[PDB]
Design a protein around this ligand. Structure first.
Ligand SMILES: FC(F)c1nc2ccccc2n1-c1nc(N2CCOCC2)nc(N2CCOCC2)n1
Length: 823
C-alpha cells in the first residue's frame, strides 16, 4: 500500500517522487522528512475531531460578509420531505426542531444531534447564525428560490470522518573567484556580480574582465566586494549576470551566501544559469534544472576560517518623526533610526518604515534592529501583508510577519491565498515559515487544502518552482490520503477534457460545427469518458458536486482555443445540481483569476459597508499549463447576442437601444421589471468602478454578459492596469436601461452616479490592502504586473495621494467625461 500511495502522489502532483530521491540533496531530504512528520501529526489530530469540528474542517461555513420564508427539509435516507415557513431571523436549530417535530407526528413518536446539508452540495448549515447570514439562504432570497435542506445526523457525519482515515571575527572584504563559463553567444563577455539584501544593494556591483565570445570562457580572477565578511546579513544573496558587449544579456544566476543550516558557503560551485529576458535579485536562488543545455558558471567561495550565522541569543547580546511618518530623505532616515525605541514604543505599526532605514550591511545595526523586533507587538493583518514583500528579506522579519498573520480568519486566508502562494517564489530555502503556515492551515481546512493544491499544481510546468511546489504537494498528501484520491479524480477528469479539447480543435478545422459537436458527444459517451468526467468535486469550488455529465448539453465555443462548455445534472441536488464549467486550454488564465479575485474582494469590502452592488463573483481556476476552468453562470447571455436583435424573438425592437430593455422585460414581466432594472443599475455601477480601478479596457458587447435577473457582469479580461490609462466607461445602451427607457431621467441616473461614487470611495479606504496584494503578486511574473508603473496605475486610479474630497472631484470629472463620450 505504501508503494501504491507513492505512485498515486507521483501521478497527482505531476512529478515522480523518485526524482526527489535522485537529487541526493540534504535540504530536499530534510524538507521531505520534517514536513511529512508535521503533516502526519495534523492527520492524527483530525481523525479524532468531534463531529461538529469535523464538519468545520471538511465543510467550512459559507457566510455573508424579519421576513417569512419557505424551506423544504428531508431526512437523509428518505423520499418524504416537508415544507415549513420560518423566519429569516431563525437559527438552523429552530428549523431542525420543526423538522423533528414533523417527523415524530408522521412516525407517531434532539436537534443538537443534526446538521443541515444543502441538497446535492458539500455545504452545511449549522451554528449560531440566523438563516439569512448563510450565503445559500441569502442567495435563495434574492433569486426567489426555496431552500432545500437535508437533516444529517451526527452518526452519519462521524462515518464520513471514519471512512476518510490515512562570524563576527571576519573583517577581510568578501570576495569570490570567477573561474569559467560554458555558453552560447555572438562581441566580448562580462560577468556582473552584486550582493543583495532583497532589492537593496549591500555595496557596489563589481564587473568581470571583458573576454571574447570565444569558448567556454575562462576567467580566473578575484572579484572583491566592498563589504566585510562579518557584515554579511543572514539572507545575503550573490547575483550574477552574464552578458555580451562590443548590450545583449545572456543569463543570470543567484545564490544565498549561507546555506539552509546557516553555515557560510565554501568553496567551488557550479551555477546553471537561467536564460535572459541585467541583475535579477528577486530571481530564484536555485540553479536551472536543464543542466544539459543551460549555460554554466563555476565560482569558488574562499575558505575564510566552519562558521554558522550567530544564534539569536548572541544577536540579542550585541518631534518631526510623526510629521513625516505617514520615500524619505537621508536626514529623515537618520531621525527614524535614532528614535527606533520610540518607534517600537509609540508607533509599532511603523515597523516597516524602520526596517527600510536600517543598514542591512552592518551587523551591529542589524543586531540593533533584531533586538527591537524580538519584543515588537503583533501587528494587524494589513501591516503583516506588507512585511511579506521581497523588500523584507530577513528571516526574522519573515517569521514575525507570519506570527502576525496567524490571526487571519479562514475566509481572509482564502481571499489572500493566491498572493501567499506567489510569495513562496521569494523564499530562499525550502523549509520556511510560510510553507509550514500554509500547510498547517490547509490541513485544518479542506477548502484551504483544495485551493492550495491547485495553485501549486497549476505551476508544475514551470521549472523554477516545480521542485518547491512538488514537495509541498507531496507533504500535503501525506497529511490527507483521502483528499489525495478526491484530487486524483479531478485530475483524471482534467486529463480527459484536454484530450477532448485537442480533438475538438482538430475537428473544427475540418468540418461543420454540428459535425464536430456530434463527434464530441460520441467521444464523451465512451465508457472511459463517462466515468472520468462524472462524480467529481468541482476544482472551481469543492462544495459543488459535478454528478452526471449531460452530454447532450455539452458543446464548444468558436473563439481561437475552442473552449469546452460542459454541463452536469444531479437528481439529488434537484436544480442547483444543474451546473456548468468551461474548460479552456491554450491561454494563460492567471490574469483572469487575479482580476476576478480582486473584483470579488471589492464586493466583500462593499458589503462590509452595507453596499450590495449585486455582483457576480464566479470562479476561475488555472489547473495546468495554459489550462484551467471557468464557472458557468447559467441564465445569462452576452450583450451582443441580445443586441443581434433577431426577428421573431421576445425582445423585438423598433430601435436597437430598446433591445436590452425589451430582453429584460421578457424575462421580468410586470412588477418584476423594476427590481431587474435595479439589479442592472447596481451591478453596472460595481463593474464600471471595478474595471476603471483595475484599468480593464477593451470592454465591449461580446465580453459583457447579463443575467435574466438584470445583473450585469464581465468575461474574458485579456488586459488590466492600462496594459492594452483607460477612461471611465459609460455605455449608452446601459445608461438607457438605467433611465428605464426614458431619454431624460436624472433621478435614476444620479442614483446610479451615487452608487459609483459610494463604491469608489469605499475602495479608496482599502487602497492599501489592494497595494500590498498587488505588491505580493509581482512574484507571479505576469507580464502585465511586472514593474512599478503597473502599481502606479492602481495608486493613480485610487487617487491615494489625494484627500477624499479631491479624489471624489477628480472622479467626478472622469465620470462626467465618460457621460459626454456616451454619444
Ligand atoms: F474564452 C471564453 F471561454 C472565456 N474566456 C474567459 C476568461 C475569463 C472569464 C470568462 C471567460 N470566458 C467565457 N466565459 C463565459 N462564462 C463564464 C461566466 O458565466 C457565463 C459564461 N462565457 C464565455 N462565452 C459565452 C458567450 O460568448 C463568449 C464566450 N466565455
Amino acid at each position: 500500500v505504501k508503494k501504491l500511495i507513492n505512485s498515486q502522489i507521483s501521478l497527482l502532483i505531476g512529478k515522480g517522487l523518485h526524482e526527489f530521491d535522485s537529487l541526493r540533496d540534504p535540504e530536499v531530504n530534510d524538507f521531505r522528512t520534517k514536513m511529512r512528520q508535521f503533516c502526519e501529526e495534523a492527520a492524527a489530530h483530525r481523525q479524532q475531531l468531534g463531529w461538529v469540528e469535523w464538519l468545520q474542517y471538511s465543510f467550512p461555513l459559507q457566510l455573508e460578509p424579519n421576513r417569512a420564508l419557505l424551506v423544504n427539509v428531508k431526512f437523509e435516507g428518505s423520499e418524504e420531505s416537508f415544507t415549513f415557513q420560518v423566519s429569516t431571523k431563525d437559527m438552523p436549530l429552530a428549523l431542525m426542531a420543526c423538522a423533528l417535530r414533523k417527523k415524530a407526528t408522521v412516525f407517531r413518536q434532539q436537534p443538537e444531534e443534526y446538521a443541515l446539508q444543502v441538497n446535492g452540495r458539500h455545504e452545511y448549515l449549522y451554528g449560531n447564525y440566523p438563516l439569512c447570514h448563510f450565503q445559500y439562504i441569502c442567495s435563495c432570497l434574492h433569486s426567489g428560490l426555496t431552500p432545500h435542506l437535508t437533516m444529517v445526523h451526527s452518526s452519519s457525519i462521524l462515518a464520513m470522518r471514519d471512512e476518510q482515515s490515512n562570524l563576527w571575527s571576519l573583517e577581510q572584504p568578501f570576495s569570490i573567484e570567477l573561474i569559467e563559463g560554458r555558453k552560447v553567444n555572438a562581441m566580448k563577455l562580462v560577468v556582473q556580480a552584486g550582493l543583495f539584501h532583497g532589492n537593496e544593494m549591500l555595496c557596489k556591483t563589481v564587473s568581470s574582465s571583458e573576454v571574447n565570445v570565444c569558448s567556454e570562457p575562462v576567467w580566473k580572477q578575484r572579484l572583491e566586494f566592498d563589504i566585510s565578511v562579518c557584515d554579511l546579513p543572514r539572507m545575503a544573496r550573490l547575483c550574477f549576470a552574464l552578458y555580451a558587449v562590443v548590450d545583449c544579456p545572456i543569463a543570470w544566476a543567484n545564490l544565498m551566501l549561507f546555506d539552509y543550516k546557516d553555515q557560510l558557503k565554501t568553496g567551488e560551485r557550479c551555477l546553471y544559469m537561467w536564460p535572459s529576458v541585467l541583475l535579477n535579485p528577486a530571481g530564484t536562488v536555485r540553479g536551472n534544472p536543464n543542466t544539459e543545455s543551460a549555460a554554466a558558471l563555476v565560482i569558488y567561495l574562499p575558505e575564510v576560517a566552519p562558521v554558522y550565522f550567530p544564534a539569536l541569543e548572541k544577536i540579542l547580546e550585541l518631534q518631526l518623526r510623526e510629521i513625516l511618518e505617514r520615500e524619505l530623505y537621508e536626514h529623515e532616515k537618520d531621525l527614524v533610526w535614532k528614535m527606533r525605541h520610540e518607534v517600537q514604543e509609540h508607533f509599532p505599526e511603523a515597523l516597516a518604515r524602520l526596517l527600510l532605514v536600517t543598514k542591512w550591511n552592518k551587523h551591529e545595526d542589524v543586531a540593533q534592529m533584531l533586538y527591537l523586533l524580538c519584543s515588537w507587538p503583533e501587528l494587524p493583518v494589513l501591516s503583516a501583508l506588507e512585511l511579506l514583500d521581497f523588500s523584507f528579506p530577513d528571516c526574522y522579519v519573515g517569521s514575525f510577519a507570519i506570527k502576525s498573520l496567524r490571526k487571519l480568519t479562514d475566509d481572509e486566508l482564502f481571499q489572500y491565498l493566491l498572493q501567499l502562494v506567489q510569495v513562496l517564489k521569494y523564499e530562499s530555502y525550502l523549509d520556511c515559515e510560510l510553507t509550514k503556515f500554509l500547510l498547517g492551515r490547509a490541513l485544518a481546512n479542506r477548502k484551504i487544502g483544495h485551493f492550495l493544491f491547485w495553485h501549486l499544481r497549476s505551476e508544475m510546468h514551470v521549472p523554477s518552482v516545480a521542485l518547491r511546489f512538488g514537495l509541498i504537494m507531496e507533504a500535503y498528501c501525506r497529511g490527507s490520503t483521502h483528499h489525495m484520491k478526491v484530487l486524483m479524480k479531478q485530475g483524471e477528469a482534467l486529463s480527459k477534457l484536454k484530450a477532448l479539447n485537442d480533438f475538438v480543435k482538430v475537428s473544427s478545422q475540418k468540418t461543420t460545427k454540428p459535425q464536430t459537436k456530434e463527434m464530441m458527444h460520441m467521444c464523451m459517451r465512451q465508457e472511459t469518458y463517462m466515468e472520468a468526467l462524472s462524480h467529481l468535486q468541482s476544482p472551481l469550488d469543492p462544495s459543488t458536486l459535478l454528478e452526471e455529465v449531460c452530454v447532450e448539453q455539452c458543446t464548444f465555443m468558436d473563439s481561437k482555443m475552442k473552449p469546452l462548455w460542459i454541463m452536469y445534472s444531479s437528481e439529488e441536488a434537484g436544480s442547483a445540481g444543474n451546473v456548468g464549467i468551461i474548460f479552456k486550454n491554450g491561454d494563460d488564465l492567471r490574469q483572469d483569476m487575479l482580476t476576478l479575485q480582486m473584483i470579488q474582494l471589492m464586493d466583500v469590502l462593499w458589503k462590509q459597508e452595507g453596499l450590495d452592488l449585486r455582483m457576480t463573483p464566479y470562479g476561475c481556476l488555472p489547473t495546468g499549463d495554459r489550462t484551467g476552468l471557468i464557472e458557468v453562470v447559467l441564465h445569462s447571455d452576452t450583450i451582443a447576442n441580445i443586441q443581434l436583435n433577431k426577428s421573431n424573438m421576445a425582445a423585438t425592437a423598433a430601435f436597437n437601444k430598446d433591445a436590452l430593455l425589451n430582453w429584460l422585460k421578457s424575462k421580468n414581466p410586470g412588477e418584476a421589471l423594476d427590481r431587474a432594472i435595479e439589479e442592472f443599475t447596481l451591478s453596472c455601477a460595481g463593474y464600471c468602478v471595478a474595471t476603471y480601478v483595475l484599468g480593464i479596457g477593451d470592454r465591449h458587447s461580446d465580453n459583457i454578459m447579463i443575467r435574466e435577473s438584470g445583473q450585469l457582469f464581465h468575461i474574458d479580461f485579456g488586459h488590466f492596469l492600462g496594459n492594452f490609462r483607460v477612461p471611465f466607461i459609460l455605455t449608452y445602451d446601459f445608461v438607457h436601461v438605467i433611465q428605464q427607457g426614458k431619454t431624460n431621467n436624472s433621478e435614476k441616473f444620479e442614483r446610479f452616479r451615487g452608487y459609483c461614487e459610494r463604491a469608489y470611495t469605499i475602495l479608496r479606504r482599502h487602497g492599501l490592502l489592494f497595494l500590498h496584494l498587488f505588491a505580493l503578486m509581482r512574484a507571479a511574473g505576469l507580464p502585465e504586473l511586472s514593474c512599478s508603473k503597473d502599481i502606479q496605475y492602481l495608486k493613480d486610479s485610487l487617487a491615494l495621494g489625494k484627500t477624499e474630497e479631491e479624489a471624489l472631484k477628480h472622479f467626478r470629472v472622469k465620470f462626467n467625461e465618460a457621460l459626454r463620450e456616451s454619444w
